[PDB]
Curated annotation (Swiss-Prot):
It catalyses: Couples ATP hydrolysis with the unwinding of duplex DNA by translocating in the 3'-5' direction; ATP + H2O = ADP + phosphate + H(+). The keyword Hydrolase applies. InterPro entries: ATP-dep_DNA_Helicase (IPR050615), Helicase/UvrB_N (IPR006935), Helicase_ATP-bd (IPR014001), Helicase_C-like (IPR001650), P-loop_NTPase (IPR027417), XPB_DRD (IPR040699). Optimum temperature is 50 degrees Celsius for 3'-5' helicase activity, still active at 65, inactive at 37 degrees Celsius. This is DNA 3'-5' translocase XPB. ATP-dependent DNA translocase which moves along double-stranded DNA (dsDNA) in a 3'-5' direction, unwinding the DNA. Unwinds DNA with a 3'-overhang but not a 5'-overhang or blunt-ended undamaged DNA; does unwind damaged blunt-ended DNA (cyclobutane pyrimidine dimer or thymine (6-4) thymine photoproduct). Binds single-stranded (ss) and dsDNA, as well as damaged DNA. Has very low ATPase activity that is repressed by Bax1; Y-form DNA and a DNA substrate with a 6 base pair bubble in the center stimulate the XPB-Bax1 ATPase activity about 6- to 10-fold. The lineage of its organism: Archaea, Methanobacteriati, Methanobacteriota, Archaeoglobi, Archaeoglobales. A motif (RED motif) lies at residues 208-210. The gene is xpb.
């Protein structure tokens, strides 16, 4: 008898295992049962312990791969990345701080059926209008006025609570606008009765006059980021915004990419991080050793990675950005010469690679500073002093992950067009599974 889980009215019913975590025995129905929000852990348990199970619990509203373009100031990129560690926490920021942008970003980053829980219908109509950037045919509202079940669904705390069991297994990401309302002994059940592994709570005031904001940690999460008004006052960045674009691989790049990852997926030799127990730092630690020869499976990781960088949707997309920005000075950093040369010929743009030279730089950046040059493609931060041409558009070609290191680095070298005062950094990332 194999293991099996299924969703039953706000709980995860469990079969074939009397030792699963959080699962307690239903004397009334001879089954082990756990509130739905413990789904993630349960999954993560079967995984890490290489246990075989059938997942008849989750019933995700099918969702496309979003690719809207969301501009994010610097602090909002920090909050976002901070949240990306566990994809399960609360973000605290003053009003006007732009929490909604961080939310949009996660929704875009994650690309899973999502439910937004808001206090009022106005806020929901407002959130629904924002959400349209993803496509209005994917935005729905589930309330007392209408009950739609689309990938991006907006609902009020009151509506979502009354249909918590109905909504319980349809979503993977729960966003709570003004999460401080969630602790209500009722509303809190929206979260508990939900399998949604990813959760985000947005708010200006986390703590409650009743301490009840202590239950969030468990159901939603605790503050993973915070900032008081007196902190934004600094004449901070505001010289640029970030908009990462996710470009999917072409029908075929996508398939090869498969026969290149299921390899290191099982890790081969051990039960590594089955369900994100790393951050790319693990594929270098104990990994990277030489010992046996069953580590050569990892070489496929080293492979899949490039399958990314060298794509066609990223050049096609870059192309698009170039015409978009064809009256501004742009740089195009990238940690791949193999990709550095390609960009150079295709758009016929002067390069500046790891080989070049010493004199083979002085001019380019001068020609880039003299004019007739508002676009170049390098491979190293052009920061070594208090000069180097005013990039009006930054662009980073990455792979399957994000280089936050070059985001900043490359970001301050970008000076804002005197008439707009806000450069634009564009990190192009791919999909696949991340």
């Amino acid at each position: 008898m194999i293991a099996e889980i299924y969703y039953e009215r706000g709980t995860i019913v469990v079969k074939g295992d009397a030792h699963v975590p959080h699962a307690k025995f239903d004397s009334r129905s001879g089954t082990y049962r756990a509130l739905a929000f413990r789904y993630r852990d349960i999954i993560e348990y079967f995984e890490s312990n290489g246990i075989e199970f059938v997942d008849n619990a989750a019933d995700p509203i099918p969702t496309p791969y979003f690719d809207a373009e969301i501009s994010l100031r610097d602090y909002q990129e920090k909050a976002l990345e901070r949240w990306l560690v566990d994809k399960r926490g609360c973000i605290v920021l003053p009003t006007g701080s732009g929490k909604t942008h961080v939310a949009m970003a996660a929704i875009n980053e994650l690309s899973t059926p999502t439910l937004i829980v808001v206090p009022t219908l106005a806020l929901a109509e407002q959130w629904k209008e924002r959400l349209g950037i993803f496509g209005e045919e994917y935005v729905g509202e589930f309330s007392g006025r209408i009950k739609e079940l689309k990938p991006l669904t907006v609902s009020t705390y009151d509506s979502a609570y009354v249909n918590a069991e109905k909504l319980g297994n349809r979503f993977m990401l729960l966003i709570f606008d003004e999460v401080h309302h969630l602790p209500a002994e009722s509303y809190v059940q929206i979260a508990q009765m939900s399998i949604a592994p990813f959760r985000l709570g947005l708010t200006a005031t986390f703590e409650r006059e009743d301490g009840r904001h202590e239950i969030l940690k468990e159901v939603v999460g605790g503050k993973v980021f915070e900032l008081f008004p007196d902190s934004l006052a600094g004449k901070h960045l505001a010289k640029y915004t970030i908009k990462r674009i996710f470009v999917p691989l072409a029908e075929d790049e996508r398939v090869e990419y498969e026969k290149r990852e299921k390899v290191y997926k099982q890790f081969l030799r051990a039960r590594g991080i089955t369900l994100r127990r790393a951050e790319d730092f693990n594929k270098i630690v104990m990994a990277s050793g030489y010992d046996e020869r069953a580590y050569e499976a990892l070489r496929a990781w080293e492979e899949a990675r490039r399958i990314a960088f060298n794509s066609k949707n990223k050049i096609r997309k870059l192309r698009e950005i170039l015409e978009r920005h064809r009256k501004d000075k742009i740089i195009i950093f990238t940690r791949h010469n193999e990709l550095v040369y390609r960009i150079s010929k295709v758009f016929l743009i002067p390069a500046i690679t790891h080989r070049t030279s010493r004199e083979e730089r002085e001019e380019i950046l001068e020609g880039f500073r003299t004019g007739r040059f508002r676009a170049i493609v390098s491979s190293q931060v052009l920061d070594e002093g208090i000069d180097v041409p005013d990039a009006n558009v930054g662009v980073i070609m990455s792979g399957s992950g994000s280089a936050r290191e070059y985001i900043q680095r490359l970001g301050r070298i970008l000076r804002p067009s005197k008439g707009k005062k806000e450069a634009v950094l564009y990190e192009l990332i791919s999909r696949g599974t991340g």
